[model samples]
Target: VVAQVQSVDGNAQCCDCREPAPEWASINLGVTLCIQCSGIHRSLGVHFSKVRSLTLDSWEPELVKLMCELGNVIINQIYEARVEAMAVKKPGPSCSRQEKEAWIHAKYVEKKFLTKLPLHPGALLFRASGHPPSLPTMADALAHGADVNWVNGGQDNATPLIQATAANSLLACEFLLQNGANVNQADSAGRGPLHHATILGHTGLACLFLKRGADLGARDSEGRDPLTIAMETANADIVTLLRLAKM
Candidate 1:
């Protein structure tokens, strides 16, 4: 079902040669490529440009989602930050192996065109000003090294899972856990997502985490387990789920 990534932003064309219908993909740099550059990357052994078939090969769903998050546009923005000023011509479909390889090496290997930049854009946007950042934003944030379980320093040390729970966003919680958010990651107060869910009266949301195999007896810094909080908040379904886990 997730194969739809091929149709998303800047993904249908080859990042290197501007070829139509790019059939291969690069995980390291998050770009689509023509067969020519894909082979050149392997021949050059550019570790930064590992390419794989978009159709012929199998993929981890996380990687499939990964491709969706930082397609050609985002990657090129970072990697080709100065191409215009340098006046360098990018390769086309007809370029020779030698010329194509030169571009790949200089562009990726030498860091000839890249400029520097930012904190975890994903986390900030996901952290949100009320509009939950798009999944692509979260994906790019993780790709940019935002730890899925990263606790924000100023905001009660809430992890993304905790934050998503605070927002009553079930799918975002699913996204976080799918992308490696520790289900039990606690905040500054040691409240795991489960504990937070219970206190906020997030019934179905808490159940979702519970179904994902959360720690039933997890304690907050204040010594309240999720059931304790559930009992306090009069959260019926969540309390039931917590009790079922105990059984």
Candidate 2:
């Protein structure tokens, strides 16, 4: 049972695995995200793959096929996975140095990933999915030649992937994964996508990253892992996920 939140906090747009709090009942993502968007998020994770096409390319045929297949089936698969996760018995709380180290390393790779980028146009495309680029737009871009992996813009060094993780983009996360984005990519603070996903309680996105092979044992530049951040954020959900990884 969730508490009734008369006023939802738009700033807290992170995707929680447990349905939203009552406050979020009306408030949705930045743009119009219907159940269709929700389904896409469940399957894809948080990274978006931009379709490249300054001009319509021959890949339109492939794009059409992807749209048809993804629109209908992806969500169902996500729902099924959610149900399965719910049914599994909860793991007991525990910890190990090896596991902890792995989580920390994942975050480190993430940081290195973000630091190696140059800024240019479509840089935001790599970050969080804003009100602009629609899912179809991304699909079309990818269809042409838009590098799903490209990074840069006014904000170089760091990346759209890191930005998206900070905002907890579920579909964006999935898109990144499909396009070969790393689940453990990090930022300047040595914060990995998982760290941000967990600290903000983006449980769904957090779980999605883990499933995508993110290292829970990764550490940050400060030598703290996601668990350390979780403790700082007082986020029980993320702390729990990290512990479960030991199993």
Candidate 3:
């Protein structure tokens, strides 16, 4: 599985030190690290990081899948999506163990490398373009005082929360809601998160908006509510949920 992960990304490197050849693994974190960096991880204690050897350790099927799914590329995209913009400090190949430790702690624990998304209208739209999106990016955006309801400047003019619902990005939607996004706020098209969720047959996402106090009676430019959109889509689950919300 580790080999497969490395194969998936030919440029796979240590999660911390950027060592080109990493032999050790953090099964809990689903990351591969260099032998030298692995020792640091192990020293951090199990609760912080559980260390193993990709070649020497007996693997768990679940952990194998986690590692395979994460790999270096995907995990780094999630963790360091804005690394270039943030100018995060990373250790080079020749860095000492102390340097590595300081960098690792700053990167992960202190989250010093993490950056807030620009409050510009394009930021959320750029994030929405990601297949699964980087939750850490969104979290950082919120932490740095991004307005959850800020809409794109493009023709769509959809808010981050609405865009997530339309894109069926449940994690992004949840992150927005958890950060106190306005569930009932409408887009330039006069459609809200529930409108997008229902129209796309995203039953669970629609339900989440409802639970977060979405206005079932809210209408779009064409005067269609979430229930109307769900009916037009013929999504039974969303239709039922919206019907009950109308009560």
Candidate 4:
């Protein structure tokens, strides 16, 4: 995990100040940090960044994977979305520590670079899943305050994962998953992502949800589970995956 995480684009360098060979990381935001920038991030409190030492700190396996899932490049794509046109340039290693500190505060807290940092983040995220989906856009939605498990109808409806399921992209689903979307969060119809995957014949998505611990026994409103849905549709591939998970 140590060597693997740095391989991500921008992870090898400090995400904040572009310092070389950063030794620290923000576990919450999934960005590698230099000692100097890490200090600033720590000052921002855990709400903005959860600072940890890449070499000195211990990590849960699941947490490590989350870091790997979203490194500095993708994170900045969301957080620094408008940096190119912004008046202030992103501070570099050659820049002052105070400059870096203020920048972190501006980017993460003020959220000025994001596209309006939507008031309706859940709807923004749900909209991002339209047609072909985007993991980056969805991640942007979350960073801007969209709950990963945001339920529309604001009632027990589809979370982002279930929405991503309908979009039929394994990458988006996993992005939502790693970002803390509940794999078993069901819709108002009582159909979880797994149940929807079966109905859509999204064999790979069903497999992904199951591997991520989607409940195989979870039944929808009609008392039918994913396996039953697959069986009824004659989804041979999904049936194989469902039966394997059943074991």
Instruction: Give lDDT tens digits, candidate 3, residues 86-119.
Output: 7666787789989988876665556565444435
- In model 4, the runs with Cα more than 4 Å from the true position are 1-12, 21-74, 81-91, 94-106, 109-115, 154-156
Q: Each candidate's lDDT (Cα)?
A: 0.71, 0.44, 0.69, 0.81
- What local lDDT does model 1 show for residue 220? 77
Error of 3 at 225 (Å): 1.0
Sort every candidate by lDDT, greatest first.
4, 1, 3, 2
Per-model TM-score on C-alpha atoms: 0.58, 0.47, 0.52, 0.70
Identify the runs in model 3 with alpha carbons over 4 angstroms from their true place: 1-130
For model 1, residues 1-247, the per-residue Cα lDDT tens digits are: 1246568687777777777788887765567888888887776453355678888888765556656766777767656667998999888888788888888788776767764432655456356411364554554454455677776777677777787788876656765765566788888888888887788888877877887888897777788998888888887787788888889
Weakest 10 consecutive residues, lDDT, candidate 3? Answer: 113-122
How big is the positional error of residue 246 in model 3, measured in Å on the Cα after superposition?
Answer: 2.1
List model 4 lDDT by residue over 1-247, tens digit each.
6687788777998887788888888876778989899999888876677788888878656566667767889888788888888776999899988888789998898887886764788888887765487656676777889877777885656777777888886666765765667888889989999998999998878878888899999998999988899889988999889888888
The candidate that wins on lDDT is 4
Model 4 alpha-carbon miss at residue 232, Å: 0.9
- Give the Cα RMSD of candidate 2: 20.0
